[PDB]
Structures are given as C-alpha cells and as structure tokens.
Design a protein around this ligand. Structure first.
Ligand SMILES: O=C(O)[C@H]1O[C@H](O)[C@H](O)[C@@H](O)[C@H]1O
Length: 612
C-alpha cells in the first residue's frame, strides 16, 4: 500500500499508515527527484516577532496552492472544486479519510466551523478578514455533505481561488472543530472556566491564545493545537526561546510517487537570533540548510554570501522579487506636521522630491549597481504594466525640482540655506526606517544629501522594528521607507496603489482605517483615493475577467496621476541559499509573501543527499 518514515514505523502506538492517510492522498510530484526519509532541516528566525518565518518555511496548507511558476492555483487541501458560471458560488470537495495531526478526522465540519464560528463571528473578528469579503459583504458558508463545503458570495468573486492560496486566505483549514469548540461559547456554555489558566478574560482572546490566527505568535507557541501541517511544534516559539523544533506530522496527508508518506525530512530546527549580523555570519559558515527570507533582499550581503559558498557547503540561488520597489518612500498624506501637510498634499511637491533624487547614485552606491531605477508600478512582464506608474520622474532634474519648489512659494531661506515655509520653519521631512536594513538606511543618507541641493531637509529616524511600527501606527512620520509590492503581485498586494492595508498603506494608515471601518474611524481620504477604493471594491466584485482588467487598470492609472509614493530602485536579485545536500529546492521560484516563499517549493518533498 503506502510506506512511512522509519521514525513512525517504530512508534507502535500509531495506526497503520494506510489508516493515517486519506483514502486517496495528494500525490506530490517532486521538483527534481524521488527522495529519502530522514534528517533535520536547519534554518533561522530573527527574534521573537518572526513567526511568519515558520509559516514561510513549512507552508500555509490552504484549500488551493500556487503552481511553481505562480501562474495559477491547483486544488491542495481540497481534492477538487467547482465554480458557478457567474463565479458567485464555490464548492470544495475534501479528501475522504484525511486526518488532523492528533488523528482526528478532517471533514467539512471543520471548514464550516472555521468560517462560521471563527472568521465570520463578529465578536471574534469585529472586522472580518478581507480575504473573504466582496464589497465588504460576507459569504454564506454551508455544509453540502460530509466532505463538501459551499461558499456563496453576494457578488462575483473571480480571485477567490488565488486568495485561498495565499497565507492570509488559509483560515478555512486552520481550526479543528473538536479542539477549538472547547474555547467557544456557542459550544462550551461555561467557557469562562478556561480564562484563568489561559491568562485571558474574554472568549475571543481565549480563542486567539489556544487556536490562534494566521500571523499570531500563539500559532507556534503550543504543542497541543492540532493542524494539518507537514511538521508540528515540539519545542515552542516563545518570548525568550533561543530555538524552535518541529517534527513530522504522523497524519500528514500526502505521498510521493512511490507511495511514501511525506514529509521526507523528520525535523526542522530554527535558531532564534535577534541580530541580523549574527545570522549573516552563521549563514556564511554553513550553519543553515536553507535561508531564503532574511538575507537576500539586501544586496550588501551578496558578495560575502557568494564568496563563502565553497567553505560553507551551500549554493546561492537568485530569486526574482515580486516587489516593484526595494526601498520606496511612502509619503504621509495625513502627516501631523501642519505646515508640511500643505505641500505634501500637492502633486507637484512630490514630483519635485522625485526629480531631486539621483537614483543612479543610489543604485551604484547603496545597491552595488545591482538594482535599477524604478517607481512603484508593475513590471513589463505583468499584464498590469503602466509606463507612467513605472517610469515617470525617474531622471535627476535638480533644476526643475528647484523651479517647482520656487513656484510653490518655498523661496525663503534659513541661516543654513534650507528652504522655509512662508511663515518660517525649515522644509523638513521625518523619514522612519528600520536601522538593520543597511541598503535602505544608506539609500536615505544619499537622498538626504541629494535633497539638500533642493533646499529640503530629510531627517533620518532609524530604529528597531518595534519602534518603527509604533511610529507608523501612531501616524508619527512624514516618510516611511520599505518595499513597494506590485512588480508581479499587484492585485494580491495592492497596498501601494490604494490605501487598503492597515499597517503598510503608509500614504496614510488613517485612510486605510477609514476604508476598513466603512468610514466609522480613521480620516476621510481625498477624492482620488476614495475613487480608487470604490474601484477596488468593484474590481473584487468584477463579473468578468475583462471587467476586472479594466477596473484595476483604472486604479493604477489614478495612482500614477497622483504620484503619492516615490520609488528608488526596483529589487536587485534576491540571494537565497540552500546547503549542497538539500535536494528538491525549486531554485527558479519567485520571491514573495503572497506565495509564502520559500515554502512555495513544497518543503515536504525537500530531502538530504550528498551526491556527485
Ligand atoms: O513576515 C513576513 O514575511 C510578512 O509579514 C507580513 O504579512 C507583511 O505584511 C508581509 O509583507 C511580510 O513581511
């Protein structure tokens, strides 16, 4: 029938392997070769707020999964699904006999519980996760039979299969009804008895503590939360741990073409290292079997990584980043600086700042000449390419920048030669940056010098990640520097074009708060942004592919016309690495959060062999 890992063969307390697998397990075709059981995968997470490093190692186990070339999705946890002709109704067929990590049957009841008792429960989630909303409206989720679940949306939802393949669309498979119902008042009529032991005082917080959510640290901090993951937490993630250990799921629901129950690798061990420089040192000494998340986006480490391949016994593979920009300037339309805000909100002021920038200098110095000047738009390889959004205002034109600033009335000068506002005060912008992002910090220093020639002061406020995010959510910045997504993943990750992401749409997080709260909170966006938000809701509800294309192209055009965020360079190659002994890593996969890379590569079929 099927075969199993020796470490499970030796555990006589488990059911036979046939009884642990679905009747028809998902058969994984390996990337390169059929594999061998065994070993520990060594990798790394940066500190104690990096739980997505586990998620992007083991992979979200969603109803669908990206293909290796990210051009479409395929049924994953679902055996198959159907779509109604108008794309309003999705029906998923599950794999009969599939089981959770604790041996409990996996059935339609779990998906209906996840959606109706957790995701769509307004006490649990006062704002419903956007992955399941069409025009701010929720689907009707119902059990069709013991292995079939139906989603009925109030409008067409063409993108739902793709959404289900992203990390943020994985709630349907995240909650086992039996275990989680213990912590839910619709099932446990004395759930308050669980509060004290869990250090909580309400049931949504109890659910978060015990059952968790996509990106909560609690997802990886307990050994008793059942899952359908390829490996399971054994040594948990915590506030002060130095390592995390996961071991194979004995009920994993996939086999290779020889009938072997996956995964091949027995164990994953994560070093928990706060200092990014210590991670670089360990990685160049070959301490990690895979590192494809933390070190590759900053090209300043690439020379050292390449140089130490032979000594460390690893191979660098270059990935194409989905991001449009490696280090974009997010200008805050709702800056609390009242004098600056009068200019920040003018298109021509933002144009001037872009024209005063020398992106060739930025590329050659901060990015070792390995990147390329770019603004915020999708790449030419994408159907979403917009020439204006990608390339306007890219060339240094200091004279025109100074001419615009003069025309805006910023002609008075202070004793250091900077421009001032008409009623005094240096024209000065505070830029927040994470201090350990070396290329981003260096980019800001070069921009500071360039803007000085236009009489504008850039104040660089570098900090640890936590203070960077606290400054952002306090609306306490004029500029925030971080990537612009959208080079390849524009509709999956539209934060730079329309203010829909509550932490990262930093042209104004108050605008995003207004969008997500239906106008009850936050700050009213300007007319061009409200129009894009309305177009975005129409796009999600588009009845046809060509209507979707038209609507999102309109969003991108308005974004180009407004020029709200200023790019420096599109990404250099992403330098990832894997040990020479680690087999079946797809070295051609793109890099990005919507595909949870490197887990896109199906880590359950990675394996170890030392081969010539
Ligand atoms: O940690 C991760 O990989 C991810 O975390 C968040 O979801 C963030 O929005 C993503 O852009 C990515 O950084």
């Amino acid at each position: 029938a099927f075969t199993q890992a020796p470490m499970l063969e030796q555990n006589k307390q488990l059911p036979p392997v046939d009884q642990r697998l679905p009747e028809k397990p998902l058969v994984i075709k390996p990337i390169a070769s059929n594999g061998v059981y065994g070993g520990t995968l060594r990798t790394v997470m940066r500190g104690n707020a990096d739980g997505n490093g586990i998620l992007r190692t083991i992979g979200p186990q969603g109803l669908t999964h990206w293909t290796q070339d990210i051009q479409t999705v395929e049924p994953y946890v679902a055996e198959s699904y159907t779509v109604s002709p108008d794309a309003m109704e999705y029906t998923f067929k599950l794999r009969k006999g599939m089981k959770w990590s604790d041996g409990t049957p996996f059935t339609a009841d779990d998906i209906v519980f996840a959606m109706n008792d957790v995701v769509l429960n307004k006490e649990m989630f006062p704002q419903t996760p956007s992955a399941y909303l069409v025009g701010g409206k929720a689907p009707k989720v119902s059990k069709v039979d013991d292995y079939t679940v139906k989603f009925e949306f109030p409008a067409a939802n063409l993108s739902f299969p793709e959404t289900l393949a992203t990390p943020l669309g994985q709630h349907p498979t995240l909650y086992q009804k039996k275990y989680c119902s213990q912590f839910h008042p619709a099932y446990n009529k004395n759930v308050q008895a669980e509060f004290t032991k869990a250090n909580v005082k309400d049931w949504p917080s109890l659910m978060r503590a015990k059952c968790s959510d996509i990106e909560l640290p609690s997802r990886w901090s307990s050994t008793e939360r059942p899952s359908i993951d390829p490996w399971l937490i054994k040594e948990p993630y915590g506030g002060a741990v130095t390592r995390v250990v996961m071991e194979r799921n004995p009920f994993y629901w996939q086999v290779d073409p020889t009938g072997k129950q996956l995964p091949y690798v027995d164990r994953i061990q994560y070093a928990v290292v706060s200092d990014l420089q210590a991670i670089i040192l360990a990685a160049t000494n070959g301490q990690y079997d895979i590192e494809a998340r933390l070190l590759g986006s900053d090209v300043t480490s690439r020379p050292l990584m390449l140089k130490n391949q032979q000594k460390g016994g690893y191979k660098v593979f270059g990935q194409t980043s989905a991001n449009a920009n490696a280090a974009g300037l997010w200008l805050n339309q709702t800056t609390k600086n009242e004098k600056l805000r009068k200019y920040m909100t003018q298109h021509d002021f933002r144009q001037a700042l872009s024209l005063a920038m020398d992106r060739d200098e930025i590329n050659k110095v901060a990015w070792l000449g390995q990147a390329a000047p770019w603004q915020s738009g999708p790449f030419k390889e994408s159907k979403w390419y917009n020439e204006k959004l990608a390339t306007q205002y890219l060339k240094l034109d200091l004279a025109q920048a100074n001419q615009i600033l003069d025309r805006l009335g910023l002609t008075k000068r202070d004793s250091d030669g900077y421009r001032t506002y008409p009623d005094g005060g240096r024209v000065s912008l505070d830029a927040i940056v994470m201090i350990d992002r070396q290329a981003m910090v260096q980019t800001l220093e070069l921009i500071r010098r360039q803007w000085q020639k236009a009489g504008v002061e850039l104040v660089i406020k570098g900090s640890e990640r936590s203070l960077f995010y606290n400054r952002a959510t306090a609306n306490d910045y004029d500029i925030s520097i971080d990537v612009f997504p959208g080079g390849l993943d524009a509709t999956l990750n539209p934060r730079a074009y329309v203010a829909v992401h509550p932490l990262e749409s930093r042209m104004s997080l108050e605008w995003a708060k207004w969008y997500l709260s239906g106008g009850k909170q936050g700050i009213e966006p300007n007319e061009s942004m409200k129009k894009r938000m309305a177009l975005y809701d129409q796009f999600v509800a588009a009845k046809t592919q060509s209507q979707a294309l038209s609507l999102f192209k309109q969003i991108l055009q308005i974004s180009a016309d407004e020029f709200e965020v200023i790019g420096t360079v599109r990404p250099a190659v992403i330098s990832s690495l894997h040990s020479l002994k680690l087999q079946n890593v797809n070295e051609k996969m793109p890099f990005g959060w919507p595909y949870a890379t490197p887990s896109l590569s199906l880590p359950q079929q990675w394996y170890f062999s030392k081969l010539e």
